[PDB]
């Protein structure tokens, strides 16, 4: 899924997603994190 927090690339989005949802991977999109499956 998507997030509503500031990201600075996939790397920052990995822990951020891990925390929010629990999908330790993901990518960033012009400011917000994205998770994977």
Q: Which candidate, 25, 24, 32, 27, places its Cα nearest to that of 7?
A: 32
| H runs (alpha helix) in 1-37 | 10-20
Query: Tokens for 27?
Result: 């990518």
Angle at 24 between CA 8 and CA 3, to 5 degrees: 55
What's the domain count of the chain? 1
Technique behind this structure?
A: NMR
CATH of the domain at 9: 3.30.30
Domain span at 29: 2-34
Cβ-Cβ contacts under 8 Å for 14 (sequence gap 6 or more): 24, 25, 26
Cβ(35)–Cβ(23) under 8 Å? yes
d(Cα 15, Cα 31) in Å, to the nearest integer? 15
């Amino acid at each position: 899924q998507f997030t509503d927090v500031k990201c600075t690339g996939s790397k920052q989005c990995w822990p951020v997603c891990k925390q929010m949802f629990g999908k330790p991977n993901g990518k960033c999109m012009n400011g917000k994190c994205r998770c994977y499956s």
